[PDB]
Design an enzyme around this catalytic site. Sequence first.
Site, PDB file in Angstrom:
ATOM      1  N   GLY A  60       0.841  -1.157   0.041  1.00 55.61           N
ATOM      2  CA  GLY A  60       0.050   0.183   0.029  1.00 55.61           C
ATOM      3  C   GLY A  60       0.965   1.237  -0.032  1.00 55.61           C
ATOM      4  N   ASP A  71     -10.162   6.363  10.271  1.00 56.30           N
ATOM      5  CA  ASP A  71     -10.238   5.931   8.747  1.00 56.30           C
ATOM      6  C   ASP A  71     -10.771   4.479   8.529  1.00 56.30           C
ATOM      7  OD1 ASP A  71      -8.985   6.260   6.252  1.00 56.30           O
ATOM      8  OD2 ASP A  71      -7.076   5.780   6.647  1.00 56.30           O
TER       9      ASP A  71
HETATM   10  C1  JAK Z   1      -2.736  -4.758   1.106  1.00 61.85           C
HETATM   11  C2  JAK Z   1      -2.041  -5.256   2.445  1.00 61.85           C
HETATM   12  N1  JAK Z   1      -1.663  -6.560   2.563  1.00 61.85           N
HETATM   13  C3  JAK Z   1      -1.224  -6.456   3.801  1.00 61.85           C
HETATM   14  C4  JAK Z   1      -0.398  -7.536   4.408  1.00 61.85           C
HETATM   15  N2  JAK Z   1      -0.129  -7.581   5.827  1.00 61.85           N
HETATM   16  C5  JAK Z   1       0.067  -6.340   6.261  1.00 61.85           C
HETATM   17  N3  JAK Z   1       0.197  -5.888   7.551  1.00 61.85           N
HETATM   18  C6  JAK Z   1       0.001  -4.566   7.587  1.00 61.85           C
HETATM   19  C7  JAK Z   1      -0.474  -3.914   6.531  1.00 61.85           C
HETATM   20  C8  JAK Z   1      -0.287  -5.085   5.545  1.00 61.85           C
HETATM   21  C9  JAK Z   1      -1.131  -5.351   4.238  1.00 61.85           C
HETATM   22  N4  JAK Z   1      -1.699  -4.520   3.319  1.00 61.85           N
HETATM   23  C10 JAK Z   1      -2.001  -3.235   3.219  1.00 61.85           C
HETATM   24  C11 JAK Z   1      -2.996  -2.669   4.502  1.00 61.85           C
HETATM   25  C12 JAK Z   1      -3.354  -1.286   4.342  1.00 61.85           C
HETATM   26  N5  JAK Z   1      -2.264  -0.364   4.300  1.00 61.85           N
HETATM   27  C13 JAK Z   1      -1.294  -1.087   3.182  1.00 61.85           C
HETATM   28  C14 JAK Z   1      -0.444  -2.183   3.337  1.00 61.85           C
END
Ligand code: JAK
EC number: 2.7.10.2
Length: 290
Positions: A14, A134
């Site tokens: 992200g 959020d």
């Molecule tokens: C999309 C995504 N997969 C993730 C797996 N573990 C994570 N652990 C922490 C985030 C995080 C992950 N994210 C996003 C969640 C929202 N913001 C960007 C990253």
Amino acid sequence: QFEERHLKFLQQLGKGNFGSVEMCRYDPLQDNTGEVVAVKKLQHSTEEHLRDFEREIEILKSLQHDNIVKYKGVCYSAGRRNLKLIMEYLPYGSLRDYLQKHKERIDHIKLLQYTSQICKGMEYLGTKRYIHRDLATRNILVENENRVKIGDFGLTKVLPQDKEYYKVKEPGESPIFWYAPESLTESKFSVASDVWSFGVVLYELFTYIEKSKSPPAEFMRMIGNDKQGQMIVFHLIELLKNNGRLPRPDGCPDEIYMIMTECWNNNVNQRPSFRDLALRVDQIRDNMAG
Ligand SMILES: Cc1nc2cnc3[nH]ccc3c2n1C1CCNCC1
């Protein structure tokens, strides 16, 4: 405290937006047999951003719950001159993508279990007087087919002792379409404004992440798709204050929509608590399953 030398990049997760999460391997044998972690870093570090990032690290570090992404540690990278946050990595990714991919499979019983888990993690935050600010499906993670976690605390705020709200005035973009009316009109954020956003999260689950049915697409359609800039906000505020709401998603049961509507109350004081919501949702599930 993670060693910078053993932290290897994998992919992005992200991007910011004032921040970014990467998929990294923590691999301090260097064997390539390592734990996969989620690494958050600053996109345009500055003194205010660093102070903010430090608050965020302390927020997550203070949280230990089945429905909150595990804090792992910090990395004092570029030789103890840069700060990165280490969180657990969830292979199933965001709930948003998960529901977009498996929509056939995920039935109503399942959406309510996820809904209830979000409430419980939200209840735990209230316990520590934290305002998330959020709540959105993209900010919820899937640990497994039976479990979700609140996965980001970038905008999270601590309420001053005995304050009910935190007025935060920020420059730049805001997720206006998930905001409570008082958050749009007076920059006021509170557990109640998180209840409003949760209502929007519940709406997202029932639309099954269908694009044309997203809160921005539905509000813009009500506002008029031509409108740009500030005129969108003016119209959003006026619409909300006079009880213009998101429509009931196709096939969404009436009792589930009523939950969404009660969260979307202009009266801050009349919005249900997260404990009330977790109870109702769990009773509905139980009166379907048990
Ligand atoms: C999309 C995504 N997969 C993730 C797996 N573990 C994570 N652990 C922490 C985030 C995080 C992950 N994210 C996003 C969640 C929202 N913001 C960007 C990253």
